[PDB]
Design a binder for this molecule. Structure first.
Ligand SMILES: CCOc1ccc(-c2nnc([C@H]3C[C@H](NC(=O)c4ccnc5cccnc45)C3)n2-c2ccccc2Cl)nc1
Ligand SMILES: [Zn+2]
Length: 208
């Protein structure tokens, strides 16, 4: 596949940086933990840098094209990704051909600035049936994986809660609505506009 995983030590500043972004961007969700479970913190078990030459070159090549179409601005963001396909993504890269046709922003790949938002998608849309072992969306036992990804948004089209980016645009930024979203969500329609830089193995922590 070409993918090498570098285990980061908890004493490493790079580990701590991803760890803090994970913990600090947790919010309380309107569904009261229906989808992602009830927690205010994670047990961070492992952070691995994903190294894949081919996937990196695919990303930077697309990033250059987006920059030239957006006044030499990539609009590059570090965003969380949750889906049941994390292990496929780190080996083969993101693939829009597996995108769900029925989502709020159509057939795109979803990212979030809130780890707890991406956590809701780890076991499927709306948390699916929960963890494969206990069928529990609030499972404190089973180990989850998120990706912390380099994402090229370029010219992002602002929408409330579609097959490709709107004409002239490179992504969609979903925005909070009183009758729609609660938190910012970002959608790309081309897999090569994201690199899965960090693989985070964690549990949601049972609150005291
Ligand atoms: C109401 C909330 O709606 C949402 C939220 C998140 C996503 C989403 N965002 N990204 C995805 C996954 C990541 C994409 N898959 C791959 O990049 C991929 C890459 C390589 N191999 C694969 C093999 C099987 C499936 N996917 C792959 C599709 N998904 C996704 C797609 C289908 C099913 C479940 C999810 Cl989480 N879609 C809709
Ligand atoms: Zn479980």
């Amino acid at each position: 596949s070409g993918t090498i995983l570098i285990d980061l030590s908890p004493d490493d500043k790079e580990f701590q940086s991803v760890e803090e972004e994970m913990q600090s961007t947790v919010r309380e969700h309107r569904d009261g933990g229906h989808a992602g479970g009830i927690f205010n913190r994670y047990n961070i078990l492992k952070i691995q840098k994903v190294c894949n030459k081919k996937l990196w070159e695919r990303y930077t090549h697309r990033r250059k094209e987006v920059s030239e179409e957006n006044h030499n601005h990539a609009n590059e963001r570090m965003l969380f990704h949750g889906s049941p396909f994390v292990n496929a993504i780190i080996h083969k890269g993101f693939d829009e051909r597996h995108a769900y046709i029925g989502g709020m922003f159509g057939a795109g790949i979803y990212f979030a600035e809130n780890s707890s938002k991406s956590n809701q998608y780890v076991y499927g849309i709306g948390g699916g049936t929960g963890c494969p072992v206990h069928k529990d969306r609030s499972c404190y036992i089973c180990h989850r994986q998120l990706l912390f990804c380099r994402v090229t948004l370029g010219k992002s089209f602002l929408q409330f809660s579609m097959a490709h980016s709107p004409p002239g645009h490179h992504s969609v930024t979903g925005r909070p609505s009183v009758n729609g979203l609660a938190l910012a969500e970002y959608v790309i329609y081309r897999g090569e506009q994201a690199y899965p830089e960090y693989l985070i193995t964690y549990q949601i922590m049972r609150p005291e």
